[PDB]
Design a protein around this ligand. Sequence first.
Ligand SMILES: CCC(=O)N1CCC[C@H](n2c(=O)c(-c3cccc(F)c3Cl)c(C)c3cnc(Nc4ccc(N5CCN(C)CC5)c(C)c4)nc32)C1
Length: 288
Amino acid sequence: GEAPNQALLRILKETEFKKIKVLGSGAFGTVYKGLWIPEGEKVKIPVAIKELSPKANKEILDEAYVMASVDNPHVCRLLGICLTSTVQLIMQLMPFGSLLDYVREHKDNIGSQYLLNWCVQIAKGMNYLEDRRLVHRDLAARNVLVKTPQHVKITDFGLAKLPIKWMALESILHRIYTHQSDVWSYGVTVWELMTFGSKPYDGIPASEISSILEKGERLPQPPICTIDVYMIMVKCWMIDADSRPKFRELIIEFSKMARDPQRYLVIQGDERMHLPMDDVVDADEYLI
Ligand SMILES: CCC(=O)N1CCC[C@H](n2c(=O)c(-c3cccc(F)c3Cl)c(C)c3cnc(Nc4ccc(N5CCN(C)CC5)c(C)c4)nc32)C1
């Protein structure tokens, strides 16, 4: 069969971390901004802690199973798990929150250089998930988190294995999901970034959309987009998925553009923008 999955999963102590503040509250549970101090290691990792029945307990353990199996620069790191009355999941802290909210928050101060690098960074993240035989199944701007304005990570693949508007057509008709089903949602996620956070197909019922794509309609060319960038989103939205590009290729193309950013994204006032307890280390450095 496949190769053995020798991911190590780490059990952490409740005494070993302390929760500063609440990041969010939902039906899943509550997520805390926090710090994690391994016993006698002189390090303080900034973490996000998720805390929340029997079916639910299961859900979080399978999440953990997934996150432990993938560890990478470009996918959020899972530090570990804690076995408590309520099981707690300990992840790397992404200080600036979701790319979707960042991109709406600073639309006026985001240059073309930052955009194209995000497109590259995310493609690299999916190329890794491709290499790991992992189909994300829910790629979207809400599920990218910002470590620094210069570094973004894919996170929240609850649905990952091995949201109609982001889904590939085949996924809508047949509930089929492939890597090429993720390339499509990649295109939608880029379209999200280039329109600076716009809702795709806003004002449209979900039940029409399947027919829309069968007719041949797609999302429009965002203003700031050269036909070079846009031509690429459109290639992700082919009906035949063997004709959509490979994440490896999107890495190469977007990378090319990144070298001459203002040739591919025309943003008004582009070149005039910029973007923003001793023991603390980032989780990316802590692991090795
Ligand atoms: C669309 C994202 C999203 O809204 N939310 C809900 C709340 C946090 C959640 N959140 C995780 O769910 C997860 C996660 C994903 C999958 C499994 C798992 F166990 C976890 Cl822990 C991680 C790793 C995570 C890491 N960093 C962070 N920083 C972070 C979030 C929100 C903010 N805000 C919200 C309100 N503020 C008052 C101002 C701005 C800020 C500044 C930072 N948030 C993380 C996801």
